[PDB]
Symmetry: none
Subunit: 139 residues, 10 copies
C-alpha cells in the first residue's frame, strides 16, 4: 500500500532548498533524510517537481535518465541484479524504472504493486546521484 510523504516535511524541505541552496551539506542531509525509505518513481518525481525550480527540474530529469540508463546497462551486464530476475521474463526495462510501463502511468498504487524492492532502491540511488550532479552543476 502506498503512503504519500507529508506535505509538511516537503514544505520544510522546499524552504530549506530555497534559503540554503542546493549544495549546502544541510540540504543534502535533509534530502538523504527524505530519501530514507525506498520511494516509488511517482514519489521522487513529485518531490523534485516541488522542491526544485523549473530549470533545475529539467536538468534533474536529464541526469536521472542518464543514471537509470547506466543502471540498466549494468543490469544487462549482470543477470543477478536485485531488480532483475533469473529468467529473461523479469528483465527490467526503463519504462518500468521511470514509471512509464503498463499499469503504472499516473497510478502510484499500481506502481507500488508491480515494482520490486530492488527496483525501488535502484531508482532511489539513481535519483540521489542525479540530484548531486544537478546541485554541483547549478552553482
Amino acid at each position: 500500500a502506498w503512503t504519500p510523504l507529508e506535505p509538511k516535511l516537503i514544505t520544510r524541505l522546499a524552504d530549506t532548498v530555497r534559503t540554503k541552496g542546493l549544495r549546502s551539506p544541510i540540504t543534502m542531509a535533509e534530502v538523504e533524510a527524505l530519501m530514507s525509505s525506498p520511494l516509488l518513481p511517482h514519489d521522487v518525481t513529485n518531490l523534485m517537481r516541488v522542491i526544485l525550480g523549473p530549470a533545475p527540474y529539467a536538468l534533474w530529469m536529464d541526469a536521472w535518465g542518464v543514471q537509470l540508463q547506466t543502471v540498466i546497462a549494468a543490469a544487462t551486464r549482470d543477470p543477478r541484479h536485485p531488480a532483475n530476475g533469473q529468467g529473461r521474463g523479469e528483465r527490467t526495462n526503463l519504462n518500468r524504472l521511470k514509471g512509464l510501463a503498463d499499469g503504472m502511468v499516473g497510478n502510484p498504487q499500481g506502481q507500488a504493486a508491480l515494482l520490486r524492492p530492488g527496483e525501488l532502491v535502484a531508482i532511489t540511488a539513481s535519483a540521489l546521484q542525479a540530484f548531486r550532479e544537478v546541485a554541483r552543476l547549478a552553482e
Copy 2:
C-alpha cells in the same frame, strides 16, 4: 508575457531560464508547444554571448535541459 522576456545584461543564466520556463509553462500555450518555444527563446533571447555559445554547439541540443547543461558547462565565468 513570455515573448517579452530578455536576459538582462547583469542577470545570470539560471535566473533567466527559471523566469522564462515559469512564464512559458504558466501561459495559454498547448502542452505540446512549450519545449520548442523554450528552446527557440533560449536561442534568440539570452544576450549574444550565450546566443553564440548555443549557436556554435558541435552537438544538436533538442531539449531545454540539455541546452541549460551545455550553457552551464561552457559559460564565461564572471
Copy 3:
C-alpha cells in the same frame, strides 16, 4: 525523324551569349537548357556556329575533337559502351561521332537514322564539356577571399567554380576546396570551422555545418 531547334530560341541564346558572355552561370544554364534532348552532330555544330564567334568556334571544334577522342579511347577500353555494340562490327569510329561517316555528311536525316541514342548522349556530353573548356579559356583560385559583406554561399560558389574550372587534377580539388574554406572565409567562419566537434572531410559537409551554425545577420 529530325526536328530542328527553334531559331527563336537560338537567337535568344545568341544574344544571351553576346551580352552576358560565355562564362556567366545564366549562360551555362541556358546552354544546359538547349542541351536537354540528345542532339545530332549537325545540331550541335550549327548551334555552336551560330552562338559562338569565329575564334571561339575554332577553339570549340578543337576541344570537342579532343573530348570525343577521350570518349573513343574509353570506348575501346570497354566493349560495353552505350555507343558500342557487343560484336566488333558495332565499334564506333570518330567519323560516326563527328558526323563524318558514310551516309551522314551534310544530311541530318540520315544522321538521325544511323546514330544510336548512346552515341547521341555521348556526343552531347562531349560538346558540353568542350563548351565549358572554351568558356574557361576565352576569358585564380588562390586569390579568392570572402569579402567583409559577402555571404558564405556566394563565396563557396565562387571558390568551387574557380577551383573546378582550373588546371588542378581531379583528385586534388576537394582537399584544396576544404583548405581554402579553412584559411579564407574571414576569421569568424574560420573559428566556426576550427571549433567543429566533428571532423568535416568534404566541402558539402563543411557548407552544411557553416550554414547551420552561422551568425544570422
Copy 4:
C-alpha cells in the same frame, strides 16, 4: 522510351530560382510542376545541376543521398515496397536508385529500361524532400 525535359522550361525555372530564390512558394510550385511526371535519376540530376549553383548542388546531393538511404532502410524494413519485389532478387540497391548500377551509368535509355515506376516515384519524392531541406538550409 526516354524523353528529355524542355530546355525552355528548364531555362525559365532557372531564372525563377535566380530572381525569386530557393524558398519562395512560387519557386516550390514551379519545382512541383516540373516534378510532375516520374523522372529518371539522370533527369533530376541534370535538372539540379542546371537550376542550382555549385554549393547548393553539393548540399542537394548530400541531402538526396540521405533521403534515399532512409528510403532503402524502409525498403529493407518492408518487402512490399513498390520499388522492391517479392523475392530477394528484386531488392533495390542504392546503386540502382542513384543510377550507379550496371547498365545505367551515364545512359538514360538503359536507365529508363531497367527502372521500376515505384523506383521512379520514390526517387522523385526523395529528390523533392532533399530540395526542400536544402532550400530551408541555404537561406
Copy 5:
C-alpha cells in the same frame, strides 16, 4: 580581302583572329584551303611579337584553334 588583313599595333589577338577567320571563310577559297591559309596568315601577319611567339613553339601547331589556344596562353599580358 583576307590577304590585306594585318593585326593593328593596339588590337588584341582574338579580335584579329575573328576578323581574319571571318574574311577567309566568307571568301572565294575552296573549303579545303581555308585552314592552311588561316594558319599561314597567323604566322606572317600578327605583328612580330606574336610572330616570334608562334615561331618558337616547341610543339607543332597544325590547326587554327591550337594556335589560338597557344597564343592566348603565352601572350604578353598588357
Copy 6:
C-alpha cells in the same frame, strides 16, 4: 607566488603561460597537483576574453598543453 599571477591587459598569452607554469613548477606543491592548478589558473586568471574563450570550448580540455593549443588557435589576433 603562483596564486598572485594575473595576465596583464597588454601581455600575450604565451608569456602569461610561461610565467605561470614557471611559478607553479618552481613552488612547494606536490608533483601530482601542478597540472590541475595550472588548468584552474588558466581558467580563472587570463583576462575575461580568454576566460570566455576557454569556457566555451566544445571539447573538454584536460591538460595545460591542450588548453594552450586551443587558445593559440582561436585567439583574437591583435
Copy 7:
C-alpha cells in the same frame, strides 16, 4: 650502458633556439644533429625540458603523446613492428615507450637495459615529429609569391616548407605544390613551365626542368 649528451652541446642548442627560434632551418638541422643516435625517453625528455620554455614544453609533451599513440596503433595493426616481438608477450605498451613502465621510472640505466633499438628509433622519430608540430604551432601557403628578385630555389624551398607544414592532408601536397609552381612563380617561369614539351607530374621534375632551362641572370 647509458652515456648522457654533452651539456656543452645542449647549451649551444638552447642558445640557438633562443636566438633563431624554433622554426628556423638551422635550428631544425641542429635538432636533427642532436637527434642522430637513438635516444632514451629520459634523454629526449630532459633535452626538451632544457631547450624549450614551459609552454612549448607542455605543447611538446602533448604532441609527443599523440604521435606515440599513433605509433602504438600502427603497432597493434602490425605484429612485425621493430619495437614489437612475434609473441604477444613482447607487445609494447605506452608505459614502456614514455619510460613509465616498471624498472624505468627515473632510472636511465634500467631504461637502456630493457628498451629495444626499434623502440628507441620509434621514440626518436615520434619526438622529432612532435617537435616539428610544436614549432609550426608556436609561431599561409596560398599567399606565397616568387619575388621579382628572388631566385627559384629559394621560392621552391619556401613554398614546399609552407605547404608541408600546414593543415593539408598528406595526399594533397604534391598537386598543390605543382599548381602553385604553375600559377605563382612570376610569368617568365610560368611560361617556361607552360611550354614544357614533356608533362611534368612531380615537384622534383618541375624543379629540375626549370633549373635546366632558366634564364641565367
Copy 8:
C-alpha cells in the same frame, strides 16, 4: 651493429653547406669525408634530409633513384656484382637498395643486418654521384 654519425659533425657540415654552398670544393671534400665509411640507406637519407633544403632534397632523391637504377641495370647485366650473388636468389632489387625491402623500412638495425658490404658501397657511390649532379644543377 649500427652506429649513427655524430650530430656535431652533421651540424658542422650543415653550416658548411649553408655558408659555402653546395658546389664549393671544400664542401665536396667535407661530404667525401663524411662519406668515408659505407653508410646504410637510413644514414645517407637522414644526412641529406638534414644538410639539404627541401627542394635540393627532392632533386637529390630523384637523382639518387636514377643512379641506383643505372646500378641495377649494370647488376642485371653482370651476375658478378659485389651486391649480387651467384645464384638468382641473391639478385638485389631496388627495394633492398633504397631500404624499402622487407625487414628494413624504418629500422636501421635490421638494415645493417641484411645488407651486403658491396650493397653499401654501391649505395654510397650512387649517393655521392647524385649529390654531385644536384650541386651542379642547383647553382
Copy 9:
C-alpha cells in the same frame, strides 16, 4: 678568333653559324673539342632571342646540326 664571334643585330642565323663553324674548325682546337665548343657558342652568343629559343628547348640538343635545325624551324620570321 672563334671566341670573339657574335651574331650581329641584323645578321641571320645561318650566316652566323657558317662563320662560327668556319672559325672553330679552322683553328688550333683538337678535333674532339669542336662540337662542344660550337654548341656552347651557339648558346652564349647568338643574341638573346635565339638564346632563349635554344634555352627553352623541350628536347635536349646534343649536336650543332640539331641545334641549327631546331632554330631554323622555330625562328621568328622577320
Copy 10:
C-alpha cells in the same frame, strides 16, 4: 674499280650552289645530274663536304642519317630489299650503309668491293632526299 668524280664538274656545281642557292630548280637539276650513277658513301660524303657550307653540311649529315634509318627499318620490314639478301647473314647494317663497316672506313676501293648495287642506289636516293630536306630547311 672506283673512279672519282671530276673536280671540274664538282667546282662548277659548287659555284652553281654558291650563286643560285640550294633550292633553285637548276641547282636540283645539276645535283640530279651528278647523282646519276650510283655513288659510294665516300663519293656522296665528299661531294656534300665540298658543295655545302659547314652548317648545311651538318644538317645534311643529320637528314641523311634519318633517311638511312628509315630505309633500314623498311629493310628489316621486308627481307626482299635489293640491299638485303635471302639469309640473315646478308642483312645490311647502318655501318655498311654509312661506310662505317669493317674494311670500308676511309677506303673507297674496299667500299666499292663489298657494297651491293642495291645498297648503292638506296644510299644515293637517301642522300638525294636528305639534300632536298636540307635545301627546303636552309631557306
